[PDB]
């Protein structure tokens with residue numbers, strides 16, 4: 001009935017690197033989705049307490065959100081671009097698991113995912 005703690009965003013025990021793919025994921029992919037008119041419900045963990053959704057974290061056991069993804073990129077949580085792409089995919093899949101076809105939040109998720117796929121289909125080459 002409490003919210004879970006948000007996902008880990010900075011792990012000192014993880015090695016860190018800068019790559020053109022990770023720079024692109026923060027500065028092009030995340031930044032573009034972040035500034036979208038429909039971004040705001042995805043910029044932080046679902047607050048199931050304040051929204052009074054007592055079943056949200058009974059159904060969604062792998063929560064993810066763009067606030068968490070942004071901090072993960074900012075703090076080198078991802079070594080491989082695929083780890084970041086997986087987190088975006090998890091965020092969209094959670095929305096489609098919990099919500100119903102035609103729901104306002106689902107139409108918002110679809111618009112962001114369309115933009116996500118447009119941007120990640122132009123990811124730069126791997127070192």
Ligand SMILES: CNC(=O)c1ccc2c(c1)nc(-c1cc(C)c(O)c(C)c1)n2CC1CCN(C(C)=O)CC1
Pocket residue numbers: 041042046047051053094095098099104105
């Ligand atoms: C100051 N406000 C807030 O902080 C606030 C308010 C409402 C929030 C909200 C945060 N987060 C969610 C949300 C997000 C996701 C990904 C979900 O899977 C679910 C079940 C809820 N909602 C409900 C949806 C907001 C957008 N919708 C519209 C504009 O119609 C649909 C409902």
